[PDB]
Design a protein around this ligand. Sequence first.
Ligand SMILES: *[C@@H]1O[C@H](CO)[C@@H](O[C@@H]2O[C@H](CO)[C@@H](O)[C@H](O)[C@H]2NC(C)=O)[C@H](O)[C@H]1NC(C)=O
Ligand SMILES: *[C@@H]1O[C@H](CO)[C@@H](O[C@@H]2O[C@H](CO)[C@@H](O)[C@H](O)[C@H]2NC(C)=O)[C@H](O)[C@H]1NC(C)=O
Ligand SMILES: *[C@@H]1O[C@H](CO)[C@@H](O[C@@H]2O[C@H](CO)[C@@H](O)[C@H](O)[C@H]2NC(C)=O)[C@H](O)[C@H]1NC(C)=O
Ligand SMILES: *[C@@H]1O[C@H](CO)[C@@H](O[C@@H]2O[C@H](CO)[C@@H](O)[C@H](O)[C@H]2NC(C)=O)[C@H](O)[C@H]1NC(C)=O
Ligand SMILES: *[C@@H]1O[C@H](CO)[C@@H](O[C@@H]2O[C@H](CO)[C@@H](O)[C@H](O)[C@H]2NC(C)=O)[C@H](O)[C@H]1NC(C)=O
Ligand SMILES: *[C@@H]1O[C@H](CO)[C@@H](O[C@@H]2O[C@H](CO)[C@@H](O)[C@H](O)[C@H]2NC(C)=O)[C@H](O)[C@H]1NC(C)=O
Ligand SMILES: *[C@@H]1O[C@H](CO)[C@@H](O)[C@H](O)[C@H]1NC(C)=O
Ligand SMILES: *[C@@H]1O[C@H](CO)[C@@H](O)[C@H](O)[C@H]1NC(C)=O
Ligand SMILES: *[C@@H]1O[C@H](CO)[C@@H](O)[C@H](O)[C@H]1NC(C)=O
Ligand SMILES: *[C@@H]1O[C@H](CO)[C@@H](O)[C@H](O)[C@H]1NC(C)=O
Ligand SMILES: *[C@@H]1O[C@H](CO)[C@@H](O)[C@H](O)[C@H]1NC(C)=O
Ligand SMILES: *[C@@H]1O[C@H](CO)[C@@H](O)[C@H](O)[C@H]1NC(C)=O
Ligand SMILES: *[C@@H]1O[C@H](CO)[C@@H](O)[C@H](O)[C@H]1NC(C)=O
Ligand SMILES: *[C@@H]1O[C@H](CO)[C@@H](O)[C@H](O)[C@H]1NC(C)=O
Lengths: 158, 593, 157, 52, 53, 53
Amino acid sequence: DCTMYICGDSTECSNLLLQYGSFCTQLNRALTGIAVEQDKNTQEVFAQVKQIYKTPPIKDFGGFNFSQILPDPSKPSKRSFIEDLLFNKVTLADAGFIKQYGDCLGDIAARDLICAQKFNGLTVLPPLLTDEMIAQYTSALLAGTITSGWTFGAGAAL
Amino acid sequence: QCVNLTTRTQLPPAYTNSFTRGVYYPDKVFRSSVLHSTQDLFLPFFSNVTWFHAIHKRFDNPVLPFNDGVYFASTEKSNIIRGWIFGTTLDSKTQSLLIVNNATNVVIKVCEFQFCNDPFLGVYYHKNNKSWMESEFRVYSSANNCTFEYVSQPFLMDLEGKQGNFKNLREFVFKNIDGYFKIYSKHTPINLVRDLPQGFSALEPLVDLPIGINITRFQTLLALHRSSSGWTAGAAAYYVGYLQPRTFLLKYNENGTITDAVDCALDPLSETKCTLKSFTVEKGIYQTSNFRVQPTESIVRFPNITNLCPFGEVFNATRFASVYAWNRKRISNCVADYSVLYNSASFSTFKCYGVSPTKLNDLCFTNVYADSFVIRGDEVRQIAPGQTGKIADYNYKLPDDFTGCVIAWNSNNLDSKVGGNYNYLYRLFRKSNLKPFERDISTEIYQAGSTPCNGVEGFNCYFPLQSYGFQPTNGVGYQPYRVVVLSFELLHAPATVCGPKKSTNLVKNKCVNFNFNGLTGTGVLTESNKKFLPFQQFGRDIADTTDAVRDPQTLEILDITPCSFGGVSVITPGTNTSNQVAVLYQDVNCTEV
Amino acid sequence: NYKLPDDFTGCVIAWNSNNLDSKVGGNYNYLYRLFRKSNLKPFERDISTEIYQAGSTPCNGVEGFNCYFPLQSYGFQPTNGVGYQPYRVVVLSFELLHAPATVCGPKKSTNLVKNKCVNFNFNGLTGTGVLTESNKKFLPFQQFGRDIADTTDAVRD
Amino acid sequence: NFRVQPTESIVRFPNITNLCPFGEVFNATRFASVYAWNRKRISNCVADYSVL
Amino acid sequence: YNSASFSTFKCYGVSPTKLNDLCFTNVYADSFVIRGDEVRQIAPGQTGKIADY
Amino acid sequence: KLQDVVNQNAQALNTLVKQLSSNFGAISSVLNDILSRLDPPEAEVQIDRLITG
Ligand SMILES: *[C@@H]1O[C@H](CO)[C@@H](O[C@@H]2O[C@H](CO)[C@@H](O)[C@H](O)[C@H]2NC(C)=O)[C@H](O)[C@H]1NC(C)=O
Ligand SMILES: *[C@@H]1O[C@H](CO)[C@@H](O[C@@H]2O[C@H](CO)[C@@H](O)[C@H](O)[C@H]2NC(C)=O)[C@H](O)[C@H]1NC(C)=O
Ligand SMILES: *[C@@H]1O[C@H](CO)[C@@H](O[C@@H]2O[C@H](CO)[C@@H](O)[C@H](O)[C@H]2NC(C)=O)[C@H](O)[C@H]1NC(C)=O
Ligand SMILES: *[C@@H]1O[C@H](CO)[C@@H](O[C@@H]2O[C@H](CO)[C@@H](O)[C@H](O)[C@H]2NC(C)=O)[C@H](O)[C@H]1NC(C)=O
Ligand SMILES: *[C@@H]1O[C@H](CO)[C@@H](O[C@@H]2O[C@H](CO)[C@@H](O)[C@H](O)[C@H]2NC(C)=O)[C@H](O)[C@H]1NC(C)=O
Ligand SMILES: *[C@@H]1O[C@H](CO)[C@@H](O[C@@H]2O[C@H](CO)[C@@H](O)[C@H](O)[C@H]2NC(C)=O)[C@H](O)[C@H]1NC(C)=O
Ligand SMILES: *[C@@H]1O[C@H](CO)[C@@H](O)[C@H](O)[C@H]1NC(C)=O
Ligand SMILES: *[C@@H]1O[C@H](CO)[C@@H](O)[C@H](O)[C@H]1NC(C)=O
Ligand SMILES: *[C@@H]1O[C@H](CO)[C@@H](O)[C@H](O)[C@H]1NC(C)=O
Ligand SMILES: *[C@@H]1O[C@H](CO)[C@@H](O)[C@H](O)[C@H]1NC(C)=O
Ligand SMILES: *[C@@H]1O[C@H](CO)[C@@H](O)[C@H](O)[C@H]1NC(C)=O
Ligand SMILES: *[C@@H]1O[C@H](CO)[C@@H](O)[C@H](O)[C@H]1NC(C)=O
Ligand SMILES: *[C@@H]1O[C@H](CO)[C@@H](O)[C@H](O)[C@H]1NC(C)=O
Ligand SMILES: *[C@@H]1O[C@H](CO)[C@@H](O)[C@H](O)[C@H]1NC(C)=O
């Protein structure tokens, strides 16, 4: 928010920023253009197929063990054991993109980054595709690779 | 005049909705086929306005608050709206604006009025000879000390009574800013039963009245009729609504007339129209801005103290020190009010380098030192950052970063005695340029030559201190000016001296406009576990803005949390599809709405 | 009593009236506001003589302890110090370039040229451009038209 | 771009032959007091400070 | 400073405290006498029978 | 490689918050310090320096 980041909670300053005009709009037009293509980047990678494939319950792969790369229903979000490792080796922001105002107001964590960014007008938009869904795209692309070979990308899964 | 109305019936103050009403041309500039975003006092769209009438048992001309500005709209038939009174107390105790129509001329007079509780203009006794001509002029008893008067060209208004729908709509924007009264008038023909016509009209500037008064209140004139408190009221209506500093888009057509407008503060949808700079919002989501919480009330908190600062012991002091050795008096634990200095008023030059003098009451200062001495008249300019002269260049210097106020006035009526006053000396010869705020009392003989002076006067040996000739007959350039230089650190420390601005109650857990030791801002005050050191007043964050202050009266540490938090999104189909919108509030639960 | 806007656009003019406005022992015809309850907005005239209340006790419109008549006079003598000598002051205030200008200085107008690049001056607004007839109709209060770039697209002769 | 220099300087002002009341304003006999100060609208004249 | 006069001292292109540390190429002293109220008219951009003429 | 994506995005946002402590040539980086001291004429000069930065 370029009215909030520049002039914090100030009417006299915000009236001066409105003399600058389209500057605030063109910055968000470029940030929105990023926010749209980042959901498009994820859309182009993880969904190449319209159908969500799942592995059959009876598993005979010829000795190949895929239980590590296949999703685990035991976890709250269905994910492979490797995707569970991949999520635990990359540190992200707080769980969920909803951070209450009372969470920042009621308790102020000394040098807290995320609140200070948000009180300065810096908001993190959530991706269109949750990690729970991304795990289900990789599951569909993996289940098709396992069962249907390479035929599911050129047409119906065979 | 003083006669009040009787048949007036008490009815609840009903309210009305204005659709696009309140839009006027912000300036005289022509614009064609453009969409112009402007910021000025406007009546918000779909704002709640007031329901007034004149009818055979309801007659309404109450005193109404003017606030920053008001929008007037009246559906009229018989021309029952004759004008207005604009004032503060609506009495002779103050000066008030009177804009009326006496059917002949349009009378705009700014006078001191004796104010009737029920002003009106009557029309009397038609029967045969249908008449419709005025008789009594009831709006004011007496008008004195008129500072402005306007009488238009003579015209004959049609006063005859009408029945059925209102055939006339008179819309007015009334705002008084900088002693300058702007009126925006628009008249369009209408056919309407009741309420207010749904539509758009761009009000145009009529005149600009240099009234220069205070206008906290106003009334509307009305007309009275009967087949002097037993009259009736002809059928009419008028609508009042309050202007607010709202941002509008303004769509100009090819001709230049405004076709439509959008209030940016209506909902998150209309804010998208302002950001997109179009009335047609495409289908999708648009980030507008965070969710802004306006401060409920302005809070002022200063260190309580009942003592006024020694303006008498500083400015009115009997004899100031000489410029070479100048008295520095610490001003602490008092109230600095320069209104007291107006009783006996002196100052020739008043310059505050670090602050603006209008903020001296709203703002207060930490360590205040009054630098007091007497210099020649032409040397007062030499007191300022970066000046040079036997004052600045030698004995008395000011910092380049100096934050404070320089105050000087003529002492000629006092410090000038008979043939001369030699008690005030100055440093004529100094070996170097002393650093700012440095006092040199050394009388050691200055050496202007190569030969050591050995502490005695002689050739190329001059005693460093010389005196100004002080005579009441000297030129004003040579007349002595007393000068007091007030120096302070500001906002970075605790402030013992604070001006005559009364502190208010302390509010926690609510968005307020806070003032602490002169530091103004908007935020939420909450208790904290931060413990400031005894010398620490304001805490600050990475952004360098003030995170926490210390309550100057009772000692406590209040965190300042900025208002207007959390993201807001607009989920809408294209405006060509539907105007219904869904508003996604990020970073929040469902509470504010 | 007399305030100027923060955005004030105009000229302030002052000169010594001591040779005139100073009469014998004093000139009390020129008063000033010593005590005002608030800070009045710019360009606001306060003629109210109502007694100012400096104390907690209501003054009831009469002078007394902590009750001061708001208007006081300047001592005007030809022998006063130049700091206390009266200066006449005229503050010229104007809106500029945003409206039609009735008052224009002693600069003689020239012939009007169309369909040729010229250096034009309209109501004090100077610029370089080509003047052409238009179908734009300005409202009676409109003088200069402007474009998206905010520069002046059209003027009114 | 291809720059076309202006051929001649054109000046167009509202014709009027009256000088503004510099005598009625600056040379006026008695000004108003500062608390109540006269505000005189100056319109439809030529403002020339060379006369002053 | 021995016989000290100046009522107004304004250096537009420099700062007066640098006049000792800094020195100048072609120095011309423009000397004349005017009425007291016309000294403000000596400055870049001023108007008056001094400046304007 | 993916941690760098989170780090650079967090560092750029965190730096952008640190950008607010810069004075930009204005007397102070705090917007409330200027409004509480200087008049709008003297604040606009200081605030426009903050806005531009
Ligand atoms: C694939 O490998 C995993 C891990 O070795 C196998 O899961 C193990 O199953 C045994 C019983 O057969 C358990 O005792 C282990 O504790 C399990 N380990 C884990 C980590 O779950 C899985 O059964 C193998 N699948 C196939 C088809 O061979
Ligand atoms: C009319 O209404 C007013 C109240 O609005 C009544 O009150 C008096 O108003 C007069 C001025 O008209 C004042 O001088 C009195 O001091 C008021 N009295 C009080 C106690 O408020 C007034 O009596 C009513 N009658 C008339 C004929 O005006
Ligand atoms: C309509 O207004 C005009 C102007 O106020 C009134 O005419 C004035 O009448 C008074 C009576 O003393 C004269 O002193 C004024 O000089 C007249 N006007 C002017 C400008 O000279 C007229 O009486 C009004 N008509 C009614 C009945 O309201
Ligand atoms: C405003 O009105 C008041 C009172 O009507 C004026 O004060 C009186 O003016 C007359 C005439 O000059 C004097 O004889 C009185 O002695 C003054 N005092 C009072 C209390 O009546 C005042 O001069 C007027 N000022 C303006 C701005 O018109
Ligand atoms: C502060 O005092 C020092 C020490 O006396 C000054 O430095 C001297 O300057 C003089 C010339 O004025 C020299 O002759 C001495 O040799 C210097 N002494 C030393 C060792 O520094 C300094 O100039 C003074 N500063 C001011 C502005 O008063
Ligand atoms: C304009 O008038 C209003 C109304 O009288 C003034 O507000 C009042 O201020 C006084 C203190 O001076 C308070 O005692 C009143 O209670 C206030 N009234 C209301 C309801 O606002 C305002 O101060 C005036 N402004 C100026 C600068 O003259
Ligand atoms: C106007 O405000 C009142 C509360 O004072 C409210 O009850 C009423 O519904 C509002 N009217 C409109 C037009 O919303
Ligand atoms: C009719 O009314 C007019 C206006 O009041 C009045 O001037 C005239 O004398 C009246 N004539 C008659 C015949 O009553
Ligand atoms: C604009 O002006 C033209 C010419 O007078 C007129 O024909 C047209 O109807 C007006 N309105 C629009 C739509 O521009
Ligand atoms: C200053 O002293 C004079 C003379 O004693 C006195 O008349 C005046 O009231 C004093 N002014 C202040 C501000 O105390
Ligand atoms: C100032 O006010 C505080 C409460 O806010 C109170 O505790 C303190 O005693 C007061 N000090 C004086 C002497 O007014
Ligand atoms: C609005 O929708 C209608 C009906 O689908 C279509 O005919 C028209 O072109 C649309 N207009 C705009 C401005 O999108
Ligand atoms: C809102 O709070 C409730 C508990 O009161 C919680 O169950 C819910 O998940 C919260 N929603 C958000 C905004 O995360
Ligand atoms: C001002 O009045 C004086 C004295 O009457 C006269 O000599 C002088 O010419 C006048 N000046 C102007 C500018 O009219």
